């Protein structure tokens, strides 16, 4: 089967005229398949999400949203590390990348973070990351 790299490259291709579900869901399927899939997925996603090409980053966030819903204790656990969460904090925060990131991209990240605090309460690092942002005034 095709590699995580191949999937995510199709799924987030800024040439895409619409969402490519075969590739989006194929990414989720594939990271679930191989032992070391989830920590790789999370590395690939973090890079796509920090793209200055907005449609690339937006599609990445849709892949992330999708696989969080579909996969996981292993995927949920990787996303729920500071190793990943820090990369999202970079994108939304004026100290880091926030100044040059579209409001669309930042709002999507903040939505996703809220939804995981509600939907995955066992991932306490996601929750900690979110009230840190809220304490800084980046949310509400």
């Amino acid at each position: 089967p095709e590699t995580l790299e191949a999937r995510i490259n199709r799924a987030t291709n800024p040439l895409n005229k619409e969402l490519d579900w075969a590739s989006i869901n194929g990414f989720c399927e594939q990271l679930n398949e191989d032992f070391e899939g989830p920590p790789l997925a999370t590395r690939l996603l973090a890079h796509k999400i920090q793209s200055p090409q907005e449609w690339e980053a937006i599609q990445a966030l849709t892949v992330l949203e999708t696989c969080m819903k579909s996969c996981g204790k292993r995927f949920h656990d990787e996303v729920g590390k500071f190793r990943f969460l820090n990369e999202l904090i970079k994108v939304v925060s004026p100290k880091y990348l926030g100044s040059r990131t579209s409001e669309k991209v930042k709002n999507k990240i903040l939505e996703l973070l809220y939804s995981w605090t509600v939907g995955l309460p066992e991932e306490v690092k996601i929750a900690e990351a979110y009230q840190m942002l809220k304490k800084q005034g980046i949310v509400k």
């Binding site: 500071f82 190793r83 820090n86 970079k90 690092k125 840190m132």
Partner: peptide
């Protein structure tokens, strides 16, 4: 595995 970065504050 239990290891992780520090929270970026």
């Amino acid at each position: 595995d239990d290891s992780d970065e520090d929270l970026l504050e």
